[PDB]
Design a protein around this ligand. Structure first.
Ligand SMILES: [Zn+2]
Lengths: 120, 242, 142, 331, 117
RNA sequence: UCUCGGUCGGGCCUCCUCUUGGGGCGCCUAGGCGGUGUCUUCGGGUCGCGUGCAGCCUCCCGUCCUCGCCUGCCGACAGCGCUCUGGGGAAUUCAGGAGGGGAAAGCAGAUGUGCCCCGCGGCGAGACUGGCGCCGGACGAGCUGC
RNA sequence: GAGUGGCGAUGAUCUGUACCCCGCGGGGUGGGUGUCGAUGGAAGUCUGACCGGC
């Protein structure tokens, strides 16, 4: 069910790096429930999930509402890599990252979901 | 604000089949419920009898680009009770339910979606309503559902694609009438994320225009969305119904 | 009120700059011997795409074979041929219709008629040619 | 509506035969007044927008009965060298305009084939036939009529063209398979009647191929036995019947159709000492079959239908007739 | 009844519905500066087709986004009377009355008594 | 019966013969009246609290006092707009205009039918050949169109 | 020398169902509720002498 699977040749790495930079700019909603709140409230600019979920059904619900809100989603293959990409000390299973009016981070979100649009 | 059980009267809107419900401290755009007693995705709605029967689902510009255009001040929406609408990019059938509430029992909505899960919720909603058809196919392949769609009056377009004008181009070259309606939602961050949004909007208008539409008006959806445009145009004629 | 305006400042025009070219401007730059892409490039310091409407190529072609050099420099296949659809083939109303609609473009003109006509609508640049180089009226960059 | 214009072409096209009928002594002048006015009323009715195949067949029936009226009145006044071909050409025009406007109307198509057959227009009949089959390919009526008239004309290859394309198309009902076993065995009846033909494995191929079809059932296989159960004067009818009963008793061996053909199987090549002999043989198969554990009600209804299905024959033992009446009473 | 607006009936104009329509052209005074509205100055405020409804239920809001038994009142004007700031209405009203009794007739009557005394 | 010149006529053309010291219907408004709501002042009536002193105290009625609000009627002067065989409503007769919906809504070349012989051609089994793994020539049983 | 047990994004913690009277225990009214009641209340059960035909 991971048909937007991100490729380990550095697209995963740019995803997790932009996760970390958004974590340092506090633009980051972590975990599946808070990701779901950000997508349902429409604050979300991009959303990554983790395909290393042991039952992946517990994150399969957010591609629905991301298709409804028309925000790009993409899966990285490790919730541990996403977890310390956030800086959490636990495994983050699905992360959402928003934006503001003016930031270089918002530019990096723009180019990043341009690459996600090249996937989907 | 719009609490459950507040008295709120309903008057018609300027468009055909669109209603506006004015209350004490607020107003709420709303359509007429085609299948009464049932909310689709869990929305507030309005019941009233003739002087049981009459019911009005409240329609959200934050969950619907078309309600964002109607509250955005759009001249015409091309859709009326009796129309045939080709909806493009139909996730879960929510705005497809509001379009189906506009064109009503005698109308027909032709919902197209690529994803299977929104396909499933679309088959739930489209099993409840009998004027919407479910089509789960690729919008980049109109010859897949050329056995399913006749010549429609309106095309609504909400896809998050970089080749949006080409998809709507070939879909209109197979399914849209001589002098047809087209109503496209555009996301400038989705077409070209490194360009300014007015230039992305004007370039998509130019791609429709050399795709032989005729742009009537453009409005940007910006108390309700950011960097989104709604372009209202008409296929092969300057005036709509022909 | 158009998107990306902050009190008669269009933030929507950013390089690569678009520039509608008029017949006045093509005549006076082939007359001033000043090459078009390199001197618009040189007066804006930024990559431009110049756009030439079919009203403008229509009026240059209506002008006779005195201006065959200006036509042959106006049909440079590098450039965006912006096809218009209105009955007149009148360039000044095509340009003010188009700029009034989108308000992205830089208008390369020289006449007091059209320059005075689009000083009235806010946030548009006017590119002229003062006999050795080009000039920009109201683009607050370089 | 420009019905007065196009109607004006058809009326003015009809005029010189009315000229010749006035100048011959055949019709009189007020008869031609009634005739021109009624032609006109039909042409405006027919070229009118909201029309019906009933309306087209009304004007075909009236125009053709006009041709017969002029024919008999011509035979009264002993005229010759007046001809019917403007009437026949005109009637082909009414039909061509008819099945051009309402082409999904098998009343129009079968009536036009009926006219084209009754005026001895054979090649044109085949052209109309092919156009009718193309607009109604799921119509066993048309595929049967094309195949049968092709067979009676004598071109069995063209008959098999119409039939094998028919069995390709009409595959819901068994009807056209029944008529192609019926017409192919009609041809084998002609071949053994004139005496490949010695083997005749074609309707057996229709049977064994017909196994794999969506209609293929036991009652329909009993209709195959009703088809093959006639023409018992043949070479290999016992081989064909025997293959049908054998194959049904290899694939559906627990059905009162198979027990019913187990009864009626020795009565194929009969029509006479063998008639009570095979009749009592059908009493051995009958008493052996009614006791068999199967759809006993369905076998009882089939044998009420069959014992009733013999009664019109004469020259029978009245004890056998009465005891089959008492067997109908007993079941 | 409108034929292409799904048979909204014509306004059965009662005095309570007319009070509610007055309140809807006057909702800017109701929210006393806390919320301003689309200025809709048409002369005839009564529309041709209206139908008085109530909000039923959102399937995500049932704790705070729902009126209670003592608040599901009968008219919009009864809701506005049920709400707060009614003494604020009366307070602003007596600012206005104290300014419209400025120098009108009790003033000049006080002047006449002041001279004649 | 080929033309030319001239002339207080007309056809033809032009601009006046309309835009009024006027009327009707509206708009606006000082104000009046009707419906109606507070505020002051006094007198009664009342739920209740307290000490059932003093009082407090929610509510109700009237008076005094004025102010106010009605998609409410009426509205002078001044001013403005529309219109004038004055202004409205209905019935019907006639002359037009716009829009919807329904309709196979289809006269691009309108020659009876059938057979045989010719001519031109199409499918087509089967058969040979030239040049470089192809392309091409040229034979042909049969069947069919026109 | 071997085999078990161990928080947290697969969601920790915090403002918020009220106040009050007492030694984690108890009590006076909440408000919203969801029931069946109830006798209790709003709450009282139209007008009354002509009309039709001719
Ligand atoms: Zn132009």
């Amino acid at each position: 069910a991971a048909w937007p699977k991100a490729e380990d040749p550095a697209l995963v790495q740019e995803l997790l790096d932009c996760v970390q930079q958004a974590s340092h700019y506090r633009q980051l909603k972590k975990g599946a429930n808070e990701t779901t709140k950000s997508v349902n409230r429409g604050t979300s600019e991009l959303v990554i999930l983790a395909a290393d979920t042991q039952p992946l059904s517990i994150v399969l619900h957010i591609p629905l509402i991301c298709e409804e809100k028309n925000v790009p989603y993409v899966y990285v293959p490790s919730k541990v890599a996403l977890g310390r990409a956030c800086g959490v000390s636990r495994a983050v299973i699905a992360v959402s990252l928003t934006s503001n009016e003016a930031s270089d981070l918002n530019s990096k979100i723009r180019a990043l979901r341009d690459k996600v649009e090249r996937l989907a | 604000g719009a609490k459950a059980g507040k008295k709120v009267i309903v008057e018609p809107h300027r468009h055909k089949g669109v209603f506006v419900a004015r209350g004490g401290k607020e107003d709420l755009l709303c359509t007429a419920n085609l299948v009464p007693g049932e909310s689709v995705y869990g929305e507030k709605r309005i019941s009233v009898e003739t002087p049981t029967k009459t019911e009005y689902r409240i329609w959200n510009p934050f969950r619907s680009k078309l309600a964002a255009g109607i509250l955005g001040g759009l001249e015409t929406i091309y859709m009326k009770p009796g129309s045939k609408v080709l909806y493009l990019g139909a996730a879960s059938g929510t705005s497809v339910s509001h379009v189906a509430d506009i064109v009503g029992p005698t109308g027909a909505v032709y919902a197209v979606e690529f994803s299977h899960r929104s396909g499933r919720d679309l088959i739930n909603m489209a099993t409840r309503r009998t004027n919407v058809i479910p089509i789960v196919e690729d919008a980049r392949k109109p010859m897949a559902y050329r056995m399913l769609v006749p010549m429609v009056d309106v095309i609504f377009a909400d896809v998050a694609q970089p080749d949006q004008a080409r998809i709507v181009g070939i879909n209109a070259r197979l399914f849209l009438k001589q002098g047809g309606g087209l109503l496209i939602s555009i996301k400038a961050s989705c077409i070209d994320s490194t360009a300014p949004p007015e230039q992305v909007f004007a370039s998509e208008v130019q791609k429709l225009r050399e795709d032989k539409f005729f742009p009537k008006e453009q409005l940007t959806l910006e108390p309700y969305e950011r960097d989104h445009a709604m372009v209202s145009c008409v296929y092969l004629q300057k005036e709509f119904e022909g | 009120m158009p998107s990306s305006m902050f009190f008669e400042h269009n933030e929507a025009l950013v390089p690569p700059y678009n520039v509608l070219v008029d017949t006045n401007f093509l005549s006076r730059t082939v007359g001033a011997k000043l090459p078009l892409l390199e001197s618009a490039m040189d007066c804006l310091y930024a990559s431009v795409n110049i756009i030439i409407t079919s009203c403008v190529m229509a009026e240059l072609e209506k002008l006779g074979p005195r201006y065959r050099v200006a036509l042959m420099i106006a049909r440079d296949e590098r450039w965006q041929r912006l096809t218009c659809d209105h009955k007149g083939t009148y360039a000044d109303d095509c340009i003010v219709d188009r700029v009034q609609k989108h308000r992205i473009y830089i208008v390369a003109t020289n006449d007091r008629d059209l320059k005075r006509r689009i000083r009235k609508i806010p946030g548009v640049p006017i590119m002229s040619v003062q006999k050795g180089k080009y000039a920009i009226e109201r683009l607050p960059g370089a | 509506a420009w019905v007065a214009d196009k109607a004006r072409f058809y009326l003015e096209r009809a005029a010189p035969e009315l000229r010749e009928w006035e100048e011959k002594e055949i019709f009189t002048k007020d008869e031609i007044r009634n005739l021109v006015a009624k032609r006109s009323d039909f042409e405006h009715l027919v070229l009118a927008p909201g029309t019906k195949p009933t309306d087209f067949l009304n004007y075909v029936n009236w125009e053709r009965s006009l041709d017969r009226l002029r024919a008999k009145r011509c035979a009264r006044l002993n005229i010759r060298s007046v001809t019917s071909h403007a009437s026949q050409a005109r009637t082909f025009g009414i039909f061509e305009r008819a099945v051009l406007k309402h082409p999904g109307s098998i009343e129009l198509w079968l009536a036009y084939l009926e006219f084209a057959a009754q005026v001895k227009a054979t090649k044109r009949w085949r052209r109309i036939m092919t156009r009718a089959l193309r607009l109604h390919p799921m119509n066993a009526s048309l595929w049967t009529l094309a195949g049968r008239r092709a067979a009676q004309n004598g071109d069995m290859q063209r008959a098999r063209a119409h039939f094998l394309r028919g069995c390709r198309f009409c595959t819901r009902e068994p009807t056209l398979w029944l008529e192609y076993a019926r017409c192919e065995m009609d041809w084998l009846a002609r071949m053994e009647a004139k005496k490949p033909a010695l083997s005749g494995a074609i309707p057996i191929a229709v049977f064994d191929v017909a196994r794999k079809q969506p209609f293929w059932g036991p009652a329909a296989a009993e209709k195959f036995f009703d088809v093959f159960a006639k023409f018992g004067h043949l070479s290999c009818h016992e081989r064909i019947i025997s293959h049908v009963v054998t194959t049904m008793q290899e694939l559906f061996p627990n059905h009162p159709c198979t027990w019913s053909v187990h009864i009626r199987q020795p009565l194929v090549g009969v029509d006479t000492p063998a008639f009570p002999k095979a009749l009592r043989e059908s009493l051995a198969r009958l008493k052996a079959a009614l006791q068999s554990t199967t759809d006993r009600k369905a076998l009882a209804t089939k044998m009420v239908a069959w014992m009733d299905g013999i009664l019109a024959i004469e020259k029978l033992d009245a004890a056998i007739r009465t005891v089959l009446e008492h067997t109908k009473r007993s079941l | 009844t409108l034929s292409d607006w799904y048979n909204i009936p014509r306004t059965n104009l009662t005095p309570e519905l007319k009070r509610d329509l007055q309140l809807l052209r006057m909702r800017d005074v109701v929210a006393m500066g806390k919320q301003f509205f689309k200025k809709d100055n048409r002369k005839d405020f009564v529309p041709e087709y209206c139908q008085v409804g109530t909000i039923i239920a959102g399937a995500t809001d049932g704790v705070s986004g729902r009126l209670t038994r003592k608040e599901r009142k009968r008219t919009i004007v009864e809701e506005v009377l049920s709400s707060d700031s009614v003494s604020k209405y009366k307070r602003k009203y007596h600012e206005i009355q104290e300014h419209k009794k400025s120098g009108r007739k009790g003033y000049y009557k006080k002047l006449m008594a002041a001279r004649k005394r």
